[PDB]
Amino acid sequence: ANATVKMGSDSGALVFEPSTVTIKAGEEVKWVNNKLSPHNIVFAADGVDADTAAKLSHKGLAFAAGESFTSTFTEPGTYTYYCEPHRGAGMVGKVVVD
Ligand SMILES: [Cu+2]
């Protein structure tokens, strides 16, 4: 099914919820802008292919509150996307396609 993850929290904390999402194999996923920007989204091939996690990865950023991203969960694997600017602070997410 369609999944939704926010690059933060509706309060004032940089977190990734749901930290883990499970959808079908072929569906997509939409993200949402939050606080503690910018909030990048890079899917480091962690169990899945590169090129795959590539299109799934987002080497961009987030500044405007309203912009969202999309990711194809076709290939069944495990994609791990974390904060580029905070790739070593305590902000990461896990994906699971079935
Ligand atoms: Cu962040």
58 is catalytic: no
- Ligand 1 centroid – CA 27 distance (Å): 25
Instruction: Specify whether domain 1-98 bears CATH 2.60.40.420.
Output: yes
CA dist., res. 41 & res. 48, Å (int): 16
Helices assigned H by DSSP within the chain: 50-56
Contact 90, 9 (CB under 8 A): no
Locate tokens 């997509």: which residue? 28
DSSP string, 32-84: E--SSS---BEEE-SSS-HHHHHHH-B-----STT---EEE--S-S--EEE-S
- Which technique? NMR
Number of C-alpha atoms within 13 angstroms, CB side, residue 27? 15
86 is catalytic: yes
Phi, psi of 84 (to 5 degrees): -60, -50
Cα separation values, 85 from 20, 79, 97, Å: 21, 18, 26
Contact 87, 69 (CB under 8 A): no
Q: Which residues crowd ion ligand 1, with CB under 5 Å? A: 14, 39, 83, 86, 91
CA dist., res. 96 & res. 22, Å (int): 5
Contact 22, 1 (CB under 8 A): no
Six-digit token string for 69: 């991203």
